[PDB]
DNA sequence: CGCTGAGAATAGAAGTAGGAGTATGCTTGCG
């Protein structure tokens, strides 16, 4: 219908995207924030867009996220005890006499609205089950824990609950259902967070195994809502998500049947599992990458996987009651028209005799994953129709069909190699440099300026990537110390290069203090790094490992790894901080685009700069700029931040394209902030042949 | 202290129901 005019739709320190062509918008606000009051907005009739309540409010705003507050917490105590909790504030949970502990008892909030780590539990075995706890933000109504009684979760208002809110003890003694959190709007999952969750919960650890049965099959059942952004460019990117999917359960050593079926208002079946063909991978990919578009209606679709899962013998055929069925279902709308989808579920559920007996509830037999996309998404009706199986999660939104696709790149990135360059798993379990394996610590002592903390990056086994003003020669060898993985000991040092181009004297009798031009250095350590879970390399520019990273073909040349990292736009950018011995990660944006000059018109203000004529004196081609507070309010770099890589985060690789140099004014522990406060750095794309030679035998395999 | 038969309300029909609703969830005016 009509559209409505944007005349005021901005949101203070954020951006927001039209969808459903223009009747719709989402606001999306930086890291650690939210839209206030409310993230979405509908075009009105009347021309104007739908009002911001909370109470009408003039202009929507970006505010800090808090972390819930614990309704309670049974048979013991928590502390600090407070209504809610700023970001990147710990709790500790202690039990009550005579109780035991289980699940994480030093939670943290982290940037994304939830609790690092996961729920604590005071238990002692006063009951038939195991205490099924209360997870951070629900209200747990029931405390017996004896045989079939029951407990209920309610979450809070205005918050959506994702998972069970009735589990009964089952015979055993581990619960029914699956453990329940609360959502609010903007809350996205994130790609690592969603591999790691899907890939365990599909498979058993013994590397992970896929548990079928003796004589036992698997048919795998891949449903996409076509109806809008997923069937977009002829389901391009549900194809590649698709197709890593087919290879890495493909790689577990089964022969699973596979179905594909698409639906905007129709299921359209493209493979079904009675075809012959439906358990050669590979003839399933290739008629995958086969698939063409052309009101959303589920229920067809999976009335079609009903219908594939259905058998017209007299009675049953063979081997029913050993094959274990998938569903996989893409969707990013999911207004359930065209009827209840949960009566087919529930049919299905029939059809596998499962939940019609109490020694064979074959819940192991039927697993229903679904992935949300987009902000328009029914929390409610993916989480009815997803399963909910005790340790395990099968709901997932996520925020683009690009976030998507980095889910399965993630999962097929998982079991390549320690090697493999900006690779990072998410674990249960993880550490702070178990996220950040190539940072390296450099420690320069001299008081004439001072403990010098610069940081570093591992770019291969003997060479360190770092800033060249850390650095001096009248800085000794034995002054000079390396720490990775975050361990106690320092590292021996060979040589330390310094770009031939460099000077920090300038231009100096020209009137200026600091010439940060090709500001990057090379530590060659002595030994060699033993890479592990905590010491990793981080990927390069123009090494053909990026180019396996950024999924290109072997013929790629580096200004085409220019223009896919480093773009004419506000680059998202990221890089780690030091904050009492956390570690971090700030995330920024490159001002590339139109904003490129409007950032480095902000180096007047740093030091000795206030009577430079030309600003591209001390600004040349070889710099990025990031901070300000447009498009959003950047993180500042601090003192000890110098050196480090400034990375970019895509298909689930990390990739360094800068080194971090010099700032305009020195903030650092912040927060009302300047505005010219910009951070510049090293662009890795214009010290290349420095790079290419110092490092030509390190087995990067430059381009 | 009684009718409300028409409108509001983050959208917004049109019934009339102390309805409903993707983050929530109602009242006009008449002694």
């Given at each position: 219908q009509g559209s409505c005019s944007?005349?005021?739709?901005?949101?203070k320190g954020g951006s927001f995207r039209l969808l459903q062509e223009g009747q719709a918008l989402e606001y999306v606000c930086p890291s650690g924030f939210y839209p206030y009051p409310v993230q979405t907005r509908t075009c009105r009739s009347t021309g104007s867009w739908s009002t911001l309540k909370t109470?009408?409010?003039?202009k929507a705003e970006c505010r800090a996220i808090h972390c819930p507050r614990p309704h309670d917490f049974e048979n013991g105590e928590y502390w600090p005890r407070s209504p809610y909790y700023n970001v990147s504030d710990e709790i500790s949970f202690h039990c009550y006499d005579g109780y035991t502990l289980r699940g994480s008892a030093n939670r943290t909030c982290q940037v994304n609205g939830r609790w690092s780590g996961q729920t604590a539990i005071c238990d002692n075995?006063?009951?038939?089950?195991?205490?099924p706890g209360i997870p951070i933000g629900t209200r747990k109504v029931g405390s017996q824990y004896r045989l079939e009684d029951s407990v209920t979760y309610h979450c809070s208002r205005g918050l959506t609950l994702r998972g069970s809110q009735r589990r009964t003890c089952q015979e055993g003694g581990s619960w029914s259902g699956t453990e329940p959190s609360c959502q609010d709007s903007f809350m996205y999952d994130t790609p690592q967070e969603v591999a790691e969750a899907f890939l365990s919960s599909l498979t058993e650890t013994i590397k992970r195994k896929i548990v079928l049965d003796p004589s036992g099959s698997m048919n795998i059942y891949l449903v996409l809502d076509g109806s809008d952004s997923i069937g977009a460019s002829n389901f391009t990117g549900a194809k590649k998500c698709l197709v890593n999917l087919i290879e890495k359960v493909a790689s577990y050593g089964v022969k699973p049947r596979y179905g594909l079926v698409t639906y905007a208002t129709y299921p359209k079946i493209w493979?079904?599992?009675?075809?012959?063909?439906?358990?050669?991978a590979d003839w399933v990919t290739k008629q995958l990458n086969e698939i063409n578009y052309e009101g959303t209606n589920t229920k067809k679709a999976l009335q079609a996987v009903y219908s594939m899962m259905s058998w017209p013998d007299d009675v049953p055929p063979e081997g029913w009651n050993r094959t274990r069925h998938v569903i996989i279902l893409m969707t990013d709308?999911?207004?359930?028209?065209?009827?209840?989808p949960i009566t087919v579920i529930d049919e299905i559920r029939d059809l596998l005799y499962?939940?019609?007996?109490?020694?064979?509830?074959?819940?192991?037999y039927l697993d229903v994953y679904v992935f949300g996309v987009g902000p328009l998404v029914n929390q409610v009706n993916i989480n009815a129709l997803a399963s909910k199986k005790d340790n395990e999660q099968h709901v997932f939104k996520v925020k683009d069909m690009e976030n998507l696709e980095d889910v399965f790149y993630q999962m097929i990135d998982e079991?390549?190699?320690?090697?493999?360059?900006?690779?990072?798993?998410?674990?249960?379990?993880?550490?702070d440099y178990h996220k950040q394996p190539w940072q390296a610590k450099i420690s320069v002592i001299r008081?004439?300026?001072?403990?010098?903390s610069c940081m570093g990056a591992v770019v291969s086994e003997y060479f360190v990537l770092t800033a060249?003003?850390?650095?001096?020669?009248?800085?000794?060898?034995?002054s000079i110390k390396v720490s990775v993985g975050g361990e106690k000991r320092d590292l021996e040092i060979e040589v330390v290069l310094f770009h031939?181009?460099?000077?920090?004297?300038?231009?100096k009798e020209a009137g200026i203090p600091e010439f940060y031009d090709y500001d990057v250095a090379l530590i060659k350590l002595k030994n060699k790094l033993k890479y592990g879970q905590t010491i990793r390399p981080i990927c390069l520019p123009c090494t053909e490992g990026t180019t396996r990273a950024l999924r290109?073909?072997?013929?790629?040349?580096c200004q085409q790894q220019k223009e896919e990292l480093l773009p004419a736009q506000d680059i998202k950018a990221l890089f780690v901080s030091e904050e009492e011995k956390k570690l971090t990660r700030k995330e920024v944006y490159i001002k590339?685009?139109?904003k490129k000059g409007s950032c480095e018109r902000d180096?007047?203000?740093?030091?000795?700069?206030?009577?430079?004529?030309?600003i591209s004196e001390v600004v040349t081609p070889r710099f990025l700029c990031t901070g300000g507070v447009s498009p959003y309010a950047d993180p500042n770099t601090c003192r000890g931040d110098s050196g480090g890589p400034l990375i970019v985060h895509k298909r689930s690789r990390f990739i360094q394209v800068g080194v971090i140099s010099w700032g305009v004014?020195?903030?650092?522990?912040?927060?009302?902030?300047?505005?010219?406060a910009r951070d510049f750095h090293i662009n890795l794309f214009q010290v290349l042949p420095w790079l290419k030679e110092k490092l030509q035998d390190e087995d990067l395999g430059f381009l």
């Open positions: 944007l005349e005021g739709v901005e949101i109470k009408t409010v003039r075995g006063a009951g038939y089950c195991s205490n493979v079904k599992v009675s075809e012959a063909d439906s358990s050669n709308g999911l207004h359930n028209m065209g009827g209840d499962i939940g019609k007996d109490r020694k064979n509830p074959r819940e192991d079991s390549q190699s320690l090697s493999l360059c900006g690779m990072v798993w998410e674990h249960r379990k993880g550490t008081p004439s300026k001072g403990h010098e060249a003003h850390c650095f001096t020669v009248d800085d000794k060898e034995h031939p181009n460099y000077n920090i004297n300038g231009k290109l073909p072997p013929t790629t040349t590339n685009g139109d180096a007047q203000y740093a030091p000795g700069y206030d009577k430079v004529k030309d004014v020195d903030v650092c522990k912040n927060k009302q902030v300047p505005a010219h």
